């Protein structure tokens with residue numbers, strides 16, 4: 001591990017506070033601007049769709065990435081939620097109601113088991129079975145996110161290979177002739193401190209770079225900064241052109 | 242049901258080129274092309290053959306997974322990116338012929354033939370060298386047949402394991418953003434006339450999938466970038482991508 005305080009400038013520049021954590025898989029070395037915050041545990045929020053998807057698939061609650069989840073007919077704040085979805089589009093548009101339903105069908109007991117098996121964060125499910133990742137007892141740090149993601153990448157989680165491959169497909173965010181990004185965004189709004197998350201990895205020809213960032217987010221105005229700042233660090237470290 | 246629409250020829254004309262683009266709307270089950278006749282003309286698949294080759298290699302265990310390393314044989318070749326170690330992902334990306342030759346040798350004539358017949362792939366003919374028949378042998382496929390093949394792949398309906406099909410689709414990943422995902426493979430038939438360039442694959446949207454297959458005359462390697470550029474001009478035109 002290495003602290004690299006120079007990255008703070010990217011935060012400073014956007015009048016922001018937070019942490020970016022980076023792991024070099026070939027060299028097994030981590031890098032971060034803030035070793036203390038990198039180990040600070042927060043609510044996972046919508047980053048919880050990763051393990052939730054995994055569990056739903058492995059238990060057959062979700063058959064596959066094509067299965068349609070019908071809108072319940074209730075209009076909500078985010079327009080893209082008000083329509084039918086599959087796993088691919090539910091992940092992309094971060095469709096809460098679909099993931100709530102997954103969680104209800106999974107159930108308290110099986111959800112607890114799976115998180116303990118995943119070694120995920122503090123493994124605590126206290127709260128509502130369908131919102132505990134948003135305002136219940138579960139907490140995870142950036143470094144623990146990486147550790148989780150590394151298992152997922154290598155297909156080493158205690159779920160089927162197939163489930164893991166489907167989720168990684170659903171995490172696809174960006175790809176071109178230089179890199180592939182698989183990742184998931186999040187915004188913890190109910191409990192202070194309000195924070196934005198971006199976690200995932202960058203795939204290169206020769207290596208893989210895992211990432212996990214969070215940043216203070218008092219309003220939804222700054223959301224774009226999750227990606228923008230992470231990329232500024234990736235460019236700096238010459239991981240992406 | 243197919244529709245000809247000759248307006249797309251302009252995109253070829255504008256780059257002082259000849260060829261065909263074929264499009265298939267999966268939701269509507271309708272095809273579109275600028276040239277119905279060329280769309281059904283069969284050509285050597287060349288490097289587009291890496292799709293079914295990858296599939297077969299995986300399904301038989303010749304390739305364990307997308308991470309398995311294929312060591313460079315130490316012979317320096319024309320294309321610099323081939324002169325290094327590769328996995329399935331990078332071998333597909335940089336279209337590394339020697340790796341795919343080795344796969345083919347290990348697969349063998351008999352198993353390769355059975356699999357292609359089972360895939361209903363092109364004319365199903367393997368005549369020629371077991372490791373180059375897709376480049377100078379007897380195998381031939383049309384753009385429409387490419388689509389029909391790709392459609393089976395997309396729906397996991399080929400006669401190989403689900404896992405193999407998923408891995409290959411992953412390896413076909415070319416481009417992705419917030420508007421579309423493109424999974425595809427390029428090709429350049431150089432040994433036998435007519436020299437042609439290929440691009441085949443599909444465009445994934447939130448709500449639909451658009452399959453594509455194009456080929457175009459390619460007397461020199463100068464025009465290679467036009468495979469993608471022209472295809473995208475049609476896709477823009479039809480408002481499939483922005």
Ligand SMILES: *C(=O)N1C[C@H](NOS(=O)(=O)O)CC[C@H]1C(N)=O
Pocket residue numbers: 045046047093094095096134184185186187188189223
């Ligand atoms: C997830 O954290 N949420 C669902 C949705 N996600 O958008 S995000 O992934 O860009 O963060 C809106 C924010 C959040 C929520 N309030 O439930």
Ligand SMILES: *C(=O)N1C[C@H](NOS(=O)(=O)O)CC[C@H]1C(N)=O
Pocket residue numbers: 286287288289335336337338376426427428429430431
């Ligand atoms: C494949 O058709 N080939 C291998 C490599 N691929 O290039 S391409 O995919 O961009 O078309 C070079 C061309 C061709 C060959 N010479 O064998």
